[PDB]
Design a protein around this ligand. Structure first.
Ligand code: HEM
Ligand SMILES: CCCCCCCCCCCCCCCC(=O)O
Length: 407
């Protein structure tokens, strides 16, 4: 068949589900970067995608993603016992107490940043979030971050995910940002190992610097650096979800009141923001052995893409996925495959995002602050979601005026 890379790139979140709807199927064979690719969508497809006896990640992600989004040698590219041993290192960071600590640091940094926002008179909300998140996560992770460098590090971390999927010179900036952030994280790992940096025993940078692999060897410093950036970078990417929290509050009538007046509502609300809004489009794996599934061939070595956005909008699962309705989560049975904005399956046994607890905790802080503490005006602007952008955002970035926290 024809190469459809251009069609995918023009509609990265919806290309797969639009083609599925046309064909009346949850899977179809296509071709990207000249490679035959099976595209999958929905709960049943997610369950097979997460079967590690049939799928592997090693070598699956296009190498332009190593130079930017993920780095080289990190957990995303591992399989089998090597993967599970590395994954445990990340999971150990995520205790309720440690997640709460990061949420508290983020609230503090948000409150610290407000006076600057008031003084500007008008802000692009998305643009203002990267730095407080950077400051909170570095402190949490045991990464020293001088006051006068926080801004620059926040821009570099942002560039890894926000400029990575840009078909322009912004991609070149993402590559330089990656080189810089790796070198910085590497100096941090080296200083922890030499004892010149006193990160605490509970902190991410300590855990990663002192992690021993399956042969009782420390991670090479570059790999430790990449894994540390695998904590810092996606925490800063929560800026996207926080912007969507603001977008939902602005565009969906009744949400603000319910959040104000119903205490259990915030949990439902942040889950629905993750279900509803596009963010991580799709994940890629390679078939590890010959099999067939639902009348489709999966020859060993076949590239396979699992459409996360389409799965989160699958009508069989949700009935009315096109609506923004937090109360739908009252009927959710916590299935590991039917709701997958940060991946599916098991956190320890597969590649599912270990950052979900942090994301939920921080999105709740954001919701709380935006309804209970912050006052702001929202001028006329284009709030529509840019489905052509990676990551997707409201076209305006969400512009606020007259921000303050007397509220
Ligand atoms: C900002 C919102 C986030 C989104 C949309 C997101 C989404 C995802 C997705 C889709 C995956 C891949 C699942 C797969 O390969 O099957 C993933 C993996 C990962 N996430 Fe996140 N994530 C976010 C935040 C975070 C945070 C805060 C952390 C901090 C620890 C984090 C750390 C990771 C790591 C280390 C992996 C690789 C895990 C593995 O391969 O086993 N993420 N994430
Ligand atoms: C060859 C073109 C590749 C296009 C690159 C696509 C990048 C995906 C963008 C999704 C939003 C980024 C989410 C942050 C993820 C993370 O921090 O790990």
């Amino acid at each position: 068949g024809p190469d459809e890379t251009l069609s995918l790139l023009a509609d990265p979140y919806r290309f797969i589900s639009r083609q599925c709807q046309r064909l009346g199927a949850n899977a179809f064979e296509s071709r990207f970067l000249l490679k035959k690719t099976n595209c999958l969508k929905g709960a049943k497809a997610a369950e097979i995608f997460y079967d590690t006896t049939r799928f592997e990640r090693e070598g699956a992600m296009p190498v332009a993603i190593q130079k930017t989004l993920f780095g080289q040698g990190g957990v995303q590219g591992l399989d089998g016992e090597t993967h599970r041993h590395r994954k445990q290192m990340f999971m150990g960071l995520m205790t309720p107490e440690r997640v709460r600590a990061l949420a508290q640091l983020f609230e503090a940094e948000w409150r610290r940043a407000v006076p600057g926002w008031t003084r500007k008179g008008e802000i692009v909300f998305y643009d203002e979030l990267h730095e407080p998140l950077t400051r909170a996560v570095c402190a949490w992770a045991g990464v020293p971050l001088p006051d006068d460098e926080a801004g620059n590090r926040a821009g570099e971390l942002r560039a890894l995910f926000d400029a990575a999927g840009s078909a322009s010179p912004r991609h070149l900036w993402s590559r330089l940002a990656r080189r810089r952030v790796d070198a910085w994280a590497k100096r941090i790992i080296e200083g922890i190992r030499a004892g010149s940096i006193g990160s605490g025993s509970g902190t991410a940078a300590y855990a990663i610097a002192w992690h021993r692999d399956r042969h009782d060897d420390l991670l090479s410093p570059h790999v430790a650096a990449v894994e540390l950036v695998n904590v810092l970078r996606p925490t800063v990417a929560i800026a996207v979800y926080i912007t969507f929290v603001a977008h939902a509050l602005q565009t969906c009538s009744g949400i603000r009141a319910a959040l104000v007046q119903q205490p259990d509502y915030a949990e439902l609300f942040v889950q629905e923001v993750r279900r509803f809004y596009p963010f991580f489009p799709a994940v890629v794996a390679r078939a590890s052995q010959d099999f067939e599934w639902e009348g489709m061939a999966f020859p060993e070595g076949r590239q396979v893409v699992l459409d996360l956005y389409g799965s989160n909008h699958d009508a069989a699962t949700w009935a009315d996925p096109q609506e923004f309705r937090p109360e739908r989560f009252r009927a959710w049975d916590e299935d590991s495959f039917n709701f997958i904005p940060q991946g599916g399956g098991d956190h320890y046994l597969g590649h599912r995002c270990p950052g979900e607890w942090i994301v939920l905790a921080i999105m709740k802080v954001a919701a709380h602050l935006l309804v209970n503490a912050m006052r702001y005006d929202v001028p006329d602007q284009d709030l529509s979601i840019d489905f052509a952008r990676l990551p997707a955002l409201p076209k305006s970035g969400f512009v606020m005026r007259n921000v303050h926290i007397g509220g």
